[PDB]
């Protein structure tokens, strides 16, 4: 490590305030998770999405 970092000095952004569902569901990014890893084609899609 070393020295502490400076202050973050935040700014107003959508992610900071996201209590409410986003406007469009199809425009919500796909939240890919571990249960995608069990299939084969699902695993290929997960790998492509990571890349």
């Amino acid at each position: 490590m070393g020295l502490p970092l400076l202050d973050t000095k935040y700014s107003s952004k959508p992610h900071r305030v996201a209590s409410i569902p986003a406007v469009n569901a199809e425009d919500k990014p796909w939240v890919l998770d571990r249960y995608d890893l069990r299939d084969e084609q699902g695993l290929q899609s997960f790998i492509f999405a990571a890349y």
Binding site: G2, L3, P4, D7
Partner: protein, 163 residues
Amino acid sequence: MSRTVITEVIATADSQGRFLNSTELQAAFGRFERAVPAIEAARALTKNQDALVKGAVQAVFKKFPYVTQPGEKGYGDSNQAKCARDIGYYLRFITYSLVASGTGPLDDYVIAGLREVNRAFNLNPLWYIEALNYIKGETGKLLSGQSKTEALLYIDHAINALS
């Protein structure tokens, strides 16, 4: 950006995205009580800063005779001045921490970056350890009661982090 009681309260409330619950107000009120002996200790310490600084320099010399002879760090009038200045810095930030009722001033001004700077300039931490122990001994006499303990907490914190 100091890490004090009120700042910790507000930061932990904002991180959780919620108003200030009653416990946080409880801690804030504890800090507000606590401020009075802290301000008393800060006053009785800033008032007698010059005696403390001189005594600390002399105590370091007494505990470390070898720094004084030529070819050492302590030999030199300018090095004497920097002795006094460094100990005055430590005392000033102890008083700041007393006022702020936290370690925020010490961590932010002295403790953060201590070891790299000491290594780069080859300053021995034991010198300041001795000076702060002298200041502790004296503030035993200057203060009494709750203020004495409150000052000793921050002097001890500085000594612990110098180690």
